[PDB]
Scaffold this active site. Structure first.
Site: not given
Ligand code: X1T
Length: 289
Positions: A33, A145
């Site tokens: 990201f 995550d």
């Protein structure tokens, strides 16, 4: 309570977002990201994450994760979570307190020649990471995550959980978009389930990394997946001592087996058989008492 940065400020203080590594520039690490850059603001080193679509993500998705990062850290301040200093929204950027010792993943691999972590340091890191996950779960947040690359280490090698862009509120729900790192993911997470129990499984993989010094996945290794050593130990092909990181001189068998026991419980394939984060916290505290 954060600081509003304009993009031009962060561009200037990162040497125009120099993509060369610091060992060479300003790039410190990368994720799906965005890229993390070193920045220098008023004689203070900071970490700047400029969000980018590197995993086939849309603009709305990236912005939604950007807003989730700020929301979580606005309400969640803890000894074992990274501290956000500000952001830029006019490209999206997040500015953090600099973690001088980088990620747990890099220190476990001794990247750039850093000295190996002692067992004593690893026990404090495991305990601190558990305290951070507990704080998130206590505040009804699922991280989604958890991995050693997302556990950073400050000036005292205190563990700081980072990367909350995928976080979801918790009170077993499902999503069509499966995200995360495969080698850390619980089976039900790979099926699209969203539950805090998946964080526990991922933390179990991190504990195996801490004990062995091996990355969760290594395509040139047998087994390729670190979590597969649990099957080998249960089927009595080997023992946990067969896999202990040899780059330590202060690991004792009882506490190593104590942390493996926590890891083994976390790695139950059946999600309801796993301990909650609070029990993991107490088991890790009993390990060193
Ligand atoms: C992605 C890798 O991030 C880093 C790598 C790295 N490498 C060093 C130097 C090495 C050389 C010797 O040992 C340490 C510091 N450092 C700091 C890093 N991150 C942060 O400070 C940081 C802080 C808050 C959030 C984030 C993130 F969520 F955006 N990141």
């Amino acid at each position: 309570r954060f600081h509003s940065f304009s993009f031009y400020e962060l561009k200037n203080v990162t040497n125009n977002f120099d993509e060369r590594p610091i060992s060479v520039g300003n790039k410190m690490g990368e994720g799906g990201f965005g890229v993390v850059y070193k920045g220098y603001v008023n004689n203070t080193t900071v970490a700047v994450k400029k969000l980018a679509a590197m995993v086939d993500i849309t603009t709305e998705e990236l912005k939604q994760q950007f807003d989730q990062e700020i929301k979580v850290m606005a309400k969640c301040q803890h000894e074992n979570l990274v501290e956000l200093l500000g952001f830029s929204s006019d490209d999206l950027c997040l500015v953090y307190v600099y973690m001088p010792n980088g990620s747990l993943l890099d220190r476990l691999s001794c990247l750039d020649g850093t000295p190996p972590l002692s067992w004593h340091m690893r026990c404090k890191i495991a305990q601190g990471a558990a305290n951070g996950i507990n704080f998130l779960h206590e505040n009804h947040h699922i991280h989604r995550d958890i991995k050693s690359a997302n556990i950073l280490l400050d000036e005292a090698f205190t563990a700081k959980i980072s990367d909350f862009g995928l976080a979801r509120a918790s009170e077993t729900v499902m999503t069509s978009r499966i995200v995360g790192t495969t080698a850390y993911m619980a089976p039900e997470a790979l099926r699209g389930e969203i539950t805090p129990k998946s964080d526990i499984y991922s933390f179990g993989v991190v504990l195996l990394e801490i004990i062995t010094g091996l990355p969760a996945v290594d395509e040139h290794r047998e087994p390729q997946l670190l979590l597969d050593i649990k099957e080998e130990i249960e089927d009595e092909e080997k023992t946990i001592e067969d896999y202990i990181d040899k780059k330590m001189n202060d690991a004792d068998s009882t506490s190593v087996e104590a942390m493996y026991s926590v890891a083994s419980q976390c790695l139950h394939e059946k999600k309801n058989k796993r301990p909650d984060i609070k029990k993991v916290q107490q088991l890790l505290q009993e390990m060193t008492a």
